Design a protein around this ligand. Structure first.
Ligand SMILES: Nc1nc2c(ncn2[C@@H]2O[C@H](COP(=O)(O)OP(=O)(O)OP(O)(O)=S)[C@@H](O)[C@H]2O)c(=O)[nH]1
Ligand SMILES: O=S([O-])[O-]
Ligand SMILES: [Mg+2]
Length: 320
C-alpha cells in the first residue's frame, strides 16, 4: 500500500536533504558512481562559499588580516574555473586554505547573517585537505551537505515497513511557490520543514524579509488550508545543530522582540515551536506532529522518520 509524502517549506529549510536521507537509510546509500556525480557540486559549493565571504569583505570594508592574502585572492579567481569542472588542484586548495585561515576572512565569516552564505560553508572549508585528495570521492555526509536550489518537482520512491512511499520535493524560494499546487492531490502527509537557525537571517530573494517570518506565513497558509484537513501535518523544526550554536551568540529578539527567555537551546527551541504551533486556527480538531531534526544527521533522521512512519501507519492506513 502507498503513502504520498509532500515536503514543503521555505528556501533552504532542508527538504532536499531529507530526500537524500531516504536513499541512505532505506536504499543503502549513494554508490561510488553516484557519489562521484556530486564531486563537482562539492567543489562548486566550496568555491562559491569562499568567494561569497571575499565579496562580503568588500561590502563590509574588512581587510585581510595578512597582506600576503591579497595575492592568494587574485589566484583564487585565476584557478577557480577548474573546481567548477570537478577538478581541485593542490595549488587551488592551498590558496583556499590560506584564505580561510586568515583572521579578516574569519571576521567576515562570523558576520554572515549580514550577507548570504551557504550553511555548509564551514563544513567544506574546514575539510579542504580531505576533499582536495587525489581521487577524492565524496562521502555520504559530503553529499548530504551539498546545496543546490530545487527548481522543479522531484519524486523519489522507496519501501519501508512494507509500505511503498512516494516522496515529493519542490523548491521553497518565492520563485518556486507557484508550483506547490501541482503536488496537492492525494497527500497522505506533509512534512513542513523550518530552518530553526534562520531566525536572524533575511531571504536570499528579499533582504528586507526575515527568513523565519516568511516560514511562519507559509506554515499558517498550509496548516490552515481546508484542502489539507485530513492530511497529517508533520512539522520538522530542522537545523537544530546550527541553532544550538547560534542561539549562544545571536539574540532571538532579532526575530521575536517579545522573547524573554535565555540564550539557550531548550527555552528558545520551545518558544519557536510554540510560535509555529500557535498558528493552527483549529487546535482541537487538527493535530501537528512536531519533531526537532538535523537533516544532515542520518541517525537522527532515521529515528525521527521511524517515529513519523509509526504515526502515519496508525492514522492513515487502516484497511476498511
Ligand atoms: N548543518 C545542517 N545543515 C543542513 C540541515 N538541513 C539542511 N542542511 C543543509 O542546508 C542546505 C540546504 O538544504 P536543502 O535541503 O537544500 O534545502 P531545501 O529546502 O531543499 O531548499 P530549496 O530547494 O527549497 S532552495 C544544504 O547545504 C543542506 O546540506 C541541518 O539540519 N543541519
Ligand atoms: O507565487 S506567485 O507567483 O503566484
Ligand atoms: Mg530543495
Amino acid at each position: 500500500r502507498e503513502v504520498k509524502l509532500l515536503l514543503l517549506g521555505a528556501g533552504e529549510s532542508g527538504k532536499s536533504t531529507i530526500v537524500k536521507q531516504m536513499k541512505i537509510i532505506h536504499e543503502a546509500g549513494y554508490s561510488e558512481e553516484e557519489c562521484k556525480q556530486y564531486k563537482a557540486v562539492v567543489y562548486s559549493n566550496t568555491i562559491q562559499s569562499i568567494i561569497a565571504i571575499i565579496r562580503a569583505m568588500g561590502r563590509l570594508k574588512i581587510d585581510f588580516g595578512d597582506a600576503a592574502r591579497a595575492d592568494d585572492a587574485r589566484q583564487l579567481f585565476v584557478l577557480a574555473g577548474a573546481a567548477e569542472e570537478g577538478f581541485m588542484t593542490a595549488e587551488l586548495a592551498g590558496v583556499i586554505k590560506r584564505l580561510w585561515k586568515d583572521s579578516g576572512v574569519q571576521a567576515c565569516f562570523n558576520r554572515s547573517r549580514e550577507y548570504q552564505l551557504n550553511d555548509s560553508a564551514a563544513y567544506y572549508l574546514n575539510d579542504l585537505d580531505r576533499i582536495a585528495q587525489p581521487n577524492y570521492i565524496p562521502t555520504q555526509q559530503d553529499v548530504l551537505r551539498t546545496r543546490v536550489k530545487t527548481t522543479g518537482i522531484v519524486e523519489t520512491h522507496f519501501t519501508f515497513k512494507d509500505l511503498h512511499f512516494k516522496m515529493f520535493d519542490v523548491g521553497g524560494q518565492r520563485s518556486e511557490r507557484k508550483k506547490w499546487i501541482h503536488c496537492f492531490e492525494g497527500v497522505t502527509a506533509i512534512i513542513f520543514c523550518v530552518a530553526l537557525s534562520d531566525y536572524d537571517l533575511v531571504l536570499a530573494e528579499d533582504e528586507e524579509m526575515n527568513r523565519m517570518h516568511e516560514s511562519m506565513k507559509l506554515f499558517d497558509s498550509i496548516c490552515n488550508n481546508k484542502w489539507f484537513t485530513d492530511t497529517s501535518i508533520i512539522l520538522f523544526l530542522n537545523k537544530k545543530d546550527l541553532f544550538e550554536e547560534k542561539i549562544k551568540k545571536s539574540p532571538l529578539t532579532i526575530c521575536y522582540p517579545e522573547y524573554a527567555g535565555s540564550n539557550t537551546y531548550e527555552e528558545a527551541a520551545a518558544y519557536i515551536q510554540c510560535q509555529f504551533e500557535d498558528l493552527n486556527k483549529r487546535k482541537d480538531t487538527k493535530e501537528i506532529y512536531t519533531h526537532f531534526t538535523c537533516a544532515t544527521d542520518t541517525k537522527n533522521v532515521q529515528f525521527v522518520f521511524d517515529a513519523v512512519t509509526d504515526v502515519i501507519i496508525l492514522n492513515n492506513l487502516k484497511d476498511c
